């Protein structure tokens, strides 16, 4: 519901329109990640290594287990669950909801813990524990692929002091990478907004294996990964055996009805005698008839739609909304002073270019396309020129579908502005200066007059 | 010293209060990192590999050694002054230097002493053939030497010296070296313009050792508790002391500092909660973290710090000034607290502050589980304060929590509050609003100008 | 053409002046990256692994191949012109394209020609069984083929084909493939929406080869000059030319540009130094880097560039406009230079500019050692200019540098300067101030509206 014609005349060519999809209705699945390799195969070339490593790991795992109990000790079941408000004291909206979620996981948590001994037994990278009825809980073990493929197969090929040294390194390195995610950085383990790729650091970042193991598969398996929607949550932490139980949340991508995200392609336009760029949102969210900004930064942009892990719409100035609809004089523009800046764009077979700053010649008519000084852009199409040559490219145009006098129409330009961070402080200060002075002329004249 | 009651009424619920700790009084310790694996065990399946690699490495190491000499050649002991001891920097020589850069150079000179002491074992360093090696240095004062890609040469290339071939044992060694350089370049490449300074994270430096900063530290002895909190808060820095372009190893001085909590200072956190006012949801635009020292309220770039449950740990003071109005708003002048329109499905609807609930029961459905009733919110209210007295155990959607007793005005929900002005924070709009405002301002200056000229 | 003297008096000490270099005139070279290891050496301990992996990879590769055809199917030669000779894009067909995207397509077409030339050795590519392998393009011309996870299959899976088992030799191969995909997605995942453009860093593309961009480049041949500076400045880009969904390899065209320092232009850096004015410390809020071309002073987003000691290297012009007032301030109108209150312990207190010192001796102990006289700063003073004239060798705190002779007004310290207005830059405060200002503005437009109606 934007006025694309006027907008294009100030360098905002109409681009691709995408759908707006958001994650929802997750479906949990639980798996275990043992963060201590099984070295029973080389119990001789161990040394203090395994002992110290256990102390180190218990160090970084303890705060996490603790933070989880602070919630397990305040959730009792009686006729759903009920959180102990006074006990919890201070909690954020989401943090509590994550705790409620933790309690239900608990049920299936203890059920898993039953195979505690069976978990330690694991001696392979990926292991399935179905020693029970239908309870087949998966167990990924860290640095296991190493212990098996490389340390064991050369148990004698090297030595026992070396088979020990190399195992210490692989453990120290794993901790070095593991720390980034589970260090003191993981202040709130209660919440469940942690990306699955982040959690997979406990398994060497092989989040591919971690998800396929669990058996997920969807035509959006990747769009969900990149849009950071496949989150995970720590359910339990065993400080004895050194393994954790994470609950992977796998959602669906559903598209918000009556809503699209229109993209505008910026194109340098000429006005006074300098190049200019309109300072207007490059992406616009429209729902029904409501135009709003969107922090598309935190989303995944594909060719057909914008996928976000949550609604990211934000308010928009009133003037900015008017500008986008027809009030072009309310559209800011900043001076262009760089060699590199978009000079033209192709919107639906038609060209929109600032010839005053690019070589526009008509390959068909052999002639060259000229731009008046009074013209901001040019609209090179089928009619004017069947096969134009903007700069080094040669493209064949189509027929423009708007006002047939676009190039002799004209448009009211907006006010110029500067967006440099330093200058925004300068301008705010500069403006207040003038404002204080004019409030003194209005104050001295008001007191002298009446 | 903030007015938490009024603040909560506009969606800024009182959260956790943390201490303000900063790093200080570092204690140095030096170690050597050899960036060339010892391949004497397979000197036959080498080939040009080791030769080219040396050329490549000498390439990226040279600028660093250079930048260090630019300071070693301008620091002489200030011998002769019986009333001042130390080093003296050649100002005219150095030319242009920043405050800190010089201080880092002065620091470099002091390491030169123990630097040369270490260099004495130059031959002993090249000898290293293990990942981590202890080169007994003086009486009890030892020096350690970490060697890059060594664990590979030993565990994987040697143990299959014949299992594969000699052309392959060569190819695989070239790759491991090229990859190491690929990761090493992000830190010691053209990027490392100023090697004089000592503000480089230890994890960054450890890239020379495959990023195994854990081993690099354990091997040095981290006799501390705040060890992890010091790591994450980027306080354990390192500094290049010496660069040997022959043997290809560098001497880094690790600074292990210690935390210390600033006296009489805390960092109060506010939990944002969407509040209803006109007929739209709103969010107050006020700092989410506030630094208070004595009675001074100031902003803090808590971004660059580590936030734990009990305190905010920073690698340096990060306090910054605060508008005057913003300080007033935080204390009671709520009409001076901006607010921006909410237009997103997801945004905090309620928060729990000291057993009590604060919710927008206009944009969320709040019911009282015990009585069954619906805890509804008036139109001229911003939030609600659901506590013992109102609802003993409420239901905010998929949650059921048991409340406690609010300790403030018992008429919080019938009190009311003066709302602030609305604003838009989108970057693009801040330019629009600055431009828009100046428009109006130029026009009103002309009405004041044309009416001032016409009147007197 | 800046007024460095006045600028220094408000804490903007003159720093190093660097050249302004930009990339240009690239020279292409093509190589192939096979993203499927050759496992013919262990065809028995395979299992479904290789099959599934092929399905997975075909998944993430398909969209890329597709996006490339959307351009190959709309570019035909321009047969029929005496003057002009080249390619012609099907505008109506392409529909919506960005300036650069088309130019990248035109570039793709001219690659394709040599692309097919390479594809001729399709079978020869699959044959590859080594990390890096060299092929025969046209006798004199050659093309290279890097194979993913090959070094693993050879050095570690084969050499222990029996040392372990066949179920394990299979498990370990599955992991190495899954992990490779895990890292490969960051760059070739849905992230890679537009494969037509050629602005993708070479290090990014090298993810297909385990991020060993060193080998990918070394094995490709690179010019000695400004090479690392070209890597770090993100100028060595790459572009996907072809995608083979059968054999699973891609042909990338690496662009090697040459830096070209744009004439009549330098980037002056200013060193910030806390200055004293009222009774508080202050910092001038002015660009720390300034781009000057001829006589035009403009801002520059030096963030996206590589800063070396000698020059600023950027992958494209990054100049941006500058307020008018800000330009004046930088030249002499110091009352037009904003300043923000300093409230942090750590903040630069002095800087060395051309052998001369510039310090806030009110907050840092300054004394001249070559005379024993304690160097003192008055209340009315913003900074101090400690040089040869007054002190041959001074001592700030515990630092000791020997100064040189200042070359400007010999009464710099008794000169004085008009201070600018104070401001607050906290993002939260900028919203508060914009709101605050508009408040006042609406009120003054009502006094001008009520007075104007009452008066005439
Ligand atoms: C305050 O600082 C100023 C400079 O910031 C001090 O003056 C300088 O002091 C230094 C060392 O005390 C002098 O060293 C000299 O360096 C020049 C090189 O300069 C070039 O440019 C000059 C421009 O005026 C030319 O005149 C020169 O011809 C030259 O091309 C040498 O040429 C000089 O001889 C001199 O000494 C060097 O040469 C001797 C020769 O035997 C060698 O032993 C060393 O190589 C010496 O380094 C410098 O000349 C001088 N510059 C001036 C005065 O402009 C000043 O002393 C400081 N105040 C005090 C008194 O402390
Ligand atoms: C000016 O520019 C425009 C756009 O760049 C050009 O005309 C428009 O585009 C085409 C011109 O060919 C036209 O579409 C009509 O032709 C289509 C193609 O038919 C052929 O399809 C196969 C070819 O590969 C093959 O089966 C066979 O050869 C077949 O004839 C058909 O889909 C259909 O006939 C199209 O016309 C109908 O559709 C339009 C659009 O919905 C509608 O108006 C009518 O229903 C119409 O009958 C477009 O319609 C053209 N647009 C218009 C209105 O002009 C044109 O080439 C340029 N002018 C010149 C001569 O330079
Ligand atoms: C808020 O509004 C303010 C006013 O609208 C903005 O400040 C104004 O900035 C403009 C520049 O865009 C200034 O205009 C010109 O200033 C000098 C001096 O010329 C002027 O002298 C008198 C002013 O007292 C008057 O006779 C005229 O205003 C006259 O223009 C000139 O050097 C420039 O113009 C020259 O150069 C340009 C090329 O760039 C040519 O096109 C022109 O023909 C001319 O040769 C400036 O444009 C203006 O002085 C200043 N304030 C005034 C008096 O209007 C302020 O920037 C804005 N804030 C923002 C950015 O949001
Ligand atoms: C730091 O001080 C060093 C002094 O110990 C200095 O090293 C020497 O630098 C000069 C460069 O001028 C080199 O000299 C070269 O050129 C002369 C020509 O007169 C030849 O006679 C020499 O053979 C040589 O090729 C010296 O080789 C070099 N000596 C050392 C110590 O290696 C550094 O350059 C100083 N660093 C800086 C940046 O000033
Ligand atoms: C509303 O809930 C309140 C709890 O948040 C409750 O008051 C508090 O009740 C606890 C016990 O549930 C008291 O704790 C202990 O200490 C006191 C003082 O020594 C003892 O008398 C208690 O028996 C108990 O062991 C808290 O001290 C108490 N808070 C205070 C100081 O009042 C309210 O009573 C509930 N409101 C009503 C009346 O329903
Ligand atoms: C500076 O303050 C001005 C008023 O104090 C403001 O202008 C007025 O802005 C309000 C909305 O903020 C507009 O009123 C609209 O209010 C709601 C919007 O949700 C609806 O009921 C209607 O759409 C209603 O129009 C006024 O129209 C507008 N007044 C006018 C014509 O100027 C400025 O926009 C403020 N500018 C800054 C710098 O913030
Ligand atoms: C969890 O709640 C229990 C309530 O029963 C608290 O009691 C602890 O119980 C454990 C049982 O192993 C003991 O080891 C502790 O000594 C008990 N603590 C106290 C203060 O008596 C316990 O505080 C809570 N656990 C947490 C979060 O630490
Ligand atoms: C606009 O200018 C006024 C001055 O006329 C600023 O208000 C002063 O701010 C300082 C520091 O915060 C106080 O010490 C003065 O007492 C204030 N004067 C008063 C009461 O008006 C105001 O902060 C400026 N605002 C902007 C946009 O920077
Ligand atoms: C590009 O042009 C071709 C040529 O007509 C289109 O045709 C398909 O090409 C694939 C190979 O890429 C064949 O296997 C199919 O059988 C062809 N089917 C058709 C005629 O649609 C191809 O689809 C075009 N690519 C696109 C869609 O841009």
Author numbering:
A (entry chain C): 27 to 105, 112 to 482
B (entry chain B): 27 to 482
C (entry chain A): 27 to 477, 513, 522 to 525
Which passages does the manuscript contain on this structure?
Henipaviruses have two surface spike glycoproteins. The G glycoprotein attaches to cell surface receptors, and upon receptor binding triggers the F glycoprotein to execute virus-host cell membrane fusion, facilitating viral entry. The henipavirus F glycoprotein is a trimeric class I transmembrane glycoprotein synthesized as a precursor F0 that undergoes post-translational cleavage by host cell cathepsin-L within the endosomal compartment, yielding the fusogenic F1 and F2 subunits held together by a disulfide bond. Crystal structures of other paramyxovirus F glycoproteins in both pre-fusion and post-fusion forms have been reported, supporting a model of the F glycoprotein undergoing a transition from a metastable pre-fusion state to a more thermodynamically stable post-fusion state upon activation.
Here we report a 3.4 Å crystal structure of the NiV-F glycoprotein in its pre-fusion form. A GCNt helical bundle motif was fused to the C-terminus of the F glycoprotein to stabilize it in the pre-fusion conformation. The NiV-F trimer has a “tree-like” overall shape, with the three copies of the F glycoprotein twined around a central axis (Axis-T) that is parallel to the C-terminal helical bundle. The fusion peptide (FP), residing in the N-terminal segment (residues 110–122) of the F1 subunit, is docked into a groove formed by the F1 subunit of a neighboring F molecule within the trimer. Furthermore, the C-terminus of F2 and N-terminus of the FP fold into a β-hairpin (S1-S2), that forms a continuous β-sheet with β-strands S3-S6 in the F1 subunit, thus securing the position of the FP and stabilizing the pre-fusion state (inset). The cathepsin-L cleavage site (R109-L110), located on the tip of the β-hairpin S1-S2, is easily accessible for cleavage in the F trimer due to its surface exposure and structural flexibility. The structure of the NiV-F glycoprotein most closely resembles the pre-fusion structure of the PIV5 F glycoprotein and the two can be superimposed with Rmsd of 2.5 Å between 1160 Cα atoms. NiV-F crystallized in the H3 space group, with two F trimers in each crystallographic asymmetric unit (AU), which, together with the other four counterparts in the two neighboring AUs, form a hexagonal arrangement of six F trimers surrounding a central axis. The two interfaces in the hexameric assembly would stabilize the pre-fusion F conformation by burying β-sheet S1-S6, and preventing separation of the F1 and F2 subunits.
